[PDB]
Amino acid sequence: TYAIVKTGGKQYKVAAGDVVKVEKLDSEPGASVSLPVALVVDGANVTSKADDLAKVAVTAEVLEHTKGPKIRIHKFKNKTGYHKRQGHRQQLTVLKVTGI
């Protein structure tokens, strides 16, 4: 039992009870969220057509909000005296899928 959740312009294969790292989305930690679907699998049978994809539902609850790890940026052009630096830290949300 694994499904594909289309969120943050991405899709992920996730199984019930799993936890995933998805982009930040406005929701208080500990609440619940529902999402359209792109594919659901249960043993043999497979549901793929976009109609069933949009007709089934995936329910999960947001665990916490995470700022990722520091990632440095260093632009530079040799011999031309251009020296540019900047840090960045993206914010992420973690989901623990509940049921399908």
Binding site: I4, K6, Q11, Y12, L39, V41, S48, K49, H74
Partner: protein
């Protein structure tokens, strides 16, 4: 008020050295030449932070082509049929499935083939 230039310089010396930690030979020892490769290695970081997406998409496409051929169809046809059926799954999930559930991959390829029109050479 003359200011003696000790602590400030040592701070950045150490910061650059630490950031360079783990490089080859004297290149993790000499600040005057660690800077060279701190700056380089981070330039490579900048460039490949996008090169990686291209490379990974390449790998996914290759895996998908392999799976389609093992299922008796060419990757381009798989994509065409999938689109014509109007599926919204992308090649990352395609590849992960193809290596995880061959049965689901088979079902998906049947869907694509069925959605594939009768004649492929039709000018329309």
């Amino acid at each position: 008020a003359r200011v003696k230039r000790a602590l400030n310089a040592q701070k950045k010396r150490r910061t650059v050295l630490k950031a360079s930690k783990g490089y080859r030979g004297q290149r993790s020892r000499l600040y005057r030449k660690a800077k060279e490769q701190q700056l380089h290695s981070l330039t490579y970081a900048y460039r490949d932070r996008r090169a990686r997406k291209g490379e990974f998409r390449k790998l996914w496409i290759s895996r998908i082509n392999a799976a389609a051929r093992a299922n008796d169809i060419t990757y381009n046809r798989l994509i065409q049929g999938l689109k014509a059926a109007g599926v919204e799954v992308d090649r990352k999930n395609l590849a992960e499935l193809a290596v995880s559930d061959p049965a689901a991959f088979t079902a998906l390829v049947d869907v694509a083939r069925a959605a594939l029109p009768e004649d492929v050479n039709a000018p329309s």
